[PDB]
Structure formats: structure tokens, C-alpha cells
């Protein structure tokens, strides 16, 4: 529907009223080492070249380990390429995500909720 294309949009509510994530990773779809990449939108003062870092480990566990999680904000937006997504998937565990940027007006952005990622149908299910 071309009418519901540009008119609507998708963002994640974060603790900071200036930092918003364009994609809604409330879910995930990785058959294997196939992660998803999102961009961060910031309405704060930060058009210079800074750094955005993100993690996704459970509070009772280490912080998840992502690759290329330190992208340089170009303007008010950043993006992750080789983003590797390998955080623990314990469903009974609380999943915690935290994003911090140290430019001129340090914006804090975190997201904490359960994770909806499960094995899709690789070749291991054969046993």
C-alpha cells in the first residue's frame, strides 16, 4: 500500500527523549550468523563525528558481545555493518540493551524486555 508506505514510520521509545532507534528489534530473525542491523536517530545536538556503542547481554550475564558495535555517528544518525549479534538467549533471563554516546550532550538510550528469538529450522534439527 503506497499510502501506508511513507506516511507511517517505526521508532523505539528510549529513556532519552532525543535518541530513538528506527528499527524495532523487539524480535529477531537470525537463522545462524545472520544478524539484523538498525540505525539510530538523534534529535539532540550531535552532528559531529562521534562514537555510538551498544550491548545486549542479560543483567545476570556478561554484556552481549557485538562486532563493529562502535560505529561513528556521521550526523544525527549512525548505522552498524558487520554487526555481529551473539548475546545469550536464555528466555527466562531479562535481556538488557544499553546505548551511550559521548559527544557534546551525552544521550543515554537503553531497552530492557524479554527476547523473541528462537531457532528457525537449520540442519541440526535432524536428530
Swiss-Prot record:
Effect of residue 91 to A: Strongly reduces DNA-binding
Effect on the protein of changing residue 123 to A: Strongly reduces DNA-binding
Compartments it resides in: Nucleus
All residue ranges annotated as the Runt domain in the record: 1-127
Site (Breakpoint for translocation to form AML1-EMV-1 (or AML1-EAP) in CML and T-MDS, to form AML1-MTG8 (ETO) in AML-M2, to form AML1-CBFA2T3 in therapy-related myeloid malignancies, to form AML1-MECOM in CML and to form type I MACROD1-RUNX1 fusion protein): 126-127
Effect of residue 55 to V: Disrupts interaction of AML1-MTG8/ETO with CBFB, no effect on AML1-MTG8/ETO-mediated transformation activity
Functional note: Forms the heterodimeric complex core-binding factor (CBF) with CBFB. RUNX members modulate the transcription of their target genes through recognizing the core consensus binding sequence 5'-TGTGGT-3', or very rarely, 5'-TGCGGT-3', within their regulatory regions via their runt domain, while CBFB is a non-DNA-binding regulatory subunit that allosterically enhances the sequence-specific DNA-binding capacity of RUNX. Isoform AML-1G shows higher binding activities for target genes and binds TCR-beta-E2 and RAG-1 target site with threefold higher affinity than other isoforms. It is less effective in the context of neutrophil terminal differentiation.
This protein's name: Runt-related transcription factor 1
Organism in which the protein naturally occurs: Homo sapiens
Taxonomic classification: Eukaryota, Metazoa, Chordata, Craniata, Vertebrata
Gene: RUNX1
Full protein segment contained here: 52 to 178 of 453
